[PDB]
Amino acid sequence: YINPLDGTYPPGTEQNPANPNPSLEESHPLNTFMFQNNRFRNRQGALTVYTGTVTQGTDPVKTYYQYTPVSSKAMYDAYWNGKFRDCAFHSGFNEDLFVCEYQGHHHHHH
Structure with missing residues (x-):
């Protein structure tokens, strides 16, 4: 097995x-x-991939959404096999975060 x-x-x-x-x-x-x-x-x-929100400076505390570059080849591999190529390049650009049509390989499980 390879993780x-x-x-x-x-x-x-x-x-x-x-x-x-x-x-x-x-x-x-x-x-x-x-x-x-x-x-x-x-x-x-x-x-x-987002690690979560972060606070910096206290009272008021500044909270930002933190995204850490994925170190796992599989997430990039998911891109290179054209599954992120099919979804990450949709124009969208509307007043809210874009939703991806892909949600993992779930046609064996619900």
């Missing part, structure tokens, strides 16, 4: 050229899309 989710590609490297810096968005841009009931970032072919 493709093992995070074997650390960002900020030659092996993974994706920016290793987790990104913070105060509010979700229309170029962002949700996949697998999660929120995902597509940036120049780089796929980012």
